[PDB]
Amino acid sequence: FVNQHLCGSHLVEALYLVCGERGFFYTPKT
Amino acid sequence: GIVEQCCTSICSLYQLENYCN
Protein backbone atom coordinates (compact mmCIF):
# COMPACT_ATOMS: atom_id res chain seq x y z
CA PHE A 1 0.00 0.00 0.00
CA VAL A 2 2.00 3.03 -1.21
CA ASN A 3 0.19 6.31 -0.45
CA GLN A 4 1.62 9.73 0.47
CA HIS A 5 4.92 8.10 1.51
CA LEU A 6 6.85 11.29 2.37
CA CYS A 7 8.83 11.03 5.63
CA GLY A 8 6.88 10.38 8.85
CA SER A 9 7.94 6.70 9.01
CA HIS A 10 6.46 6.38 5.50
CA LEU A 11 9.75 6.05 3.59
CA VAL A 12 10.67 3.47 6.24
CA GLU A 13 7.44 1.44 6.14
CA ALA A 14 7.20 1.44 2.34
CA LEU A 15 10.83 0.30 2.55
CA TYR A 16 10.09 -2.30 5.26
CA LEU A 17 8.14 -4.37 2.70
CA VAL A 18 10.04 -3.69 -0.54
CA CYS A 19 13.58 -4.93 0.18
CA GLY A 20 12.14 -7.87 2.16
CA GLU A 21 15.11 -7.54 4.54
CA ARG A 22 16.35 -5.39 7.45
CA GLY A 23 19.30 -3.42 6.03
CA PHE A 24 19.42 -0.51 3.56
CA PHE A 25 21.36 2.72 2.87
CA TYR A 26 19.29 5.41 4.61
CA THR A 27 22.34 7.68 5.01
CA PRO A 28 22.61 11.46 4.46
CA LYS A 29 25.70 13.31 3.20
CA THR A 30 28.63 14.38 5.41
CA GLY B 1 22.30 18.64 4.37
CA ILE B 2 18.97 16.86 4.52
CA VAL B 3 17.80 15.89 1.02
CA GLU B 4 14.06 15.61 0.26
CA GLN B 5 13.90 12.64 -2.11
CA CYS B 6 10.63 10.71 -1.75
CA CYS B 7 9.79 13.02 1.17
CA THR B 8 8.21 15.94 -0.74
CA SER B 9 9.29 15.94 -4.41
CA ILE B 10 9.48 13.03 -6.90
CA CYS B 11 9.12 9.32 -6.02
CA SER B 12 5.75 7.65 -6.66
CA LEU B 13 5.94 4.12 -8.10
CA TYR B 14 8.52 4.37 -10.91
CA GLN B 15 12.00 5.10 -9.50
CA LEU B 16 11.63 2.96 -6.38
CA GLU B 17 11.16 -0.80 -6.96
CA ASN B 18 14.89 -0.73 -6.20
CA TYR B 19 15.55 1.56 -3.21
CA CYS B 20 18.01 -1.13 -2.05
CA ASN B 21 18.50 -3.15 -5.26
Instruction: Give the DSSP letter of residue A8.
Output: S
Give B7→chain A minimum CA distance, Å: 4
Q: How many CB pairs under 8 A join A and B?
A: 34
> Method of determination?
NMR
Cα(B11)–Cα(B8) distance, integer angstroms: 9
> Closest Cα partner for A4 from B7, B16, B15, B5?
B7
CB contact at 8 A, A15 and A5: no
Cα(A6)–Cα(B12) distance, integer angstroms: 10
| 3-state SS, residue A12 | helix
Cα(A1)–Cα(A26) distance, integer angstroms: 21
Which are the contacts of A26, defined by CB distance < 8 A and separation ≥ 6?
A: A12, A15
Q: How many other C-beta atoms lie within 10 A of the C-beta of residue A2? A: 13
Q: Do A5 and B11 touch (CB under 8 A)?
A: yes
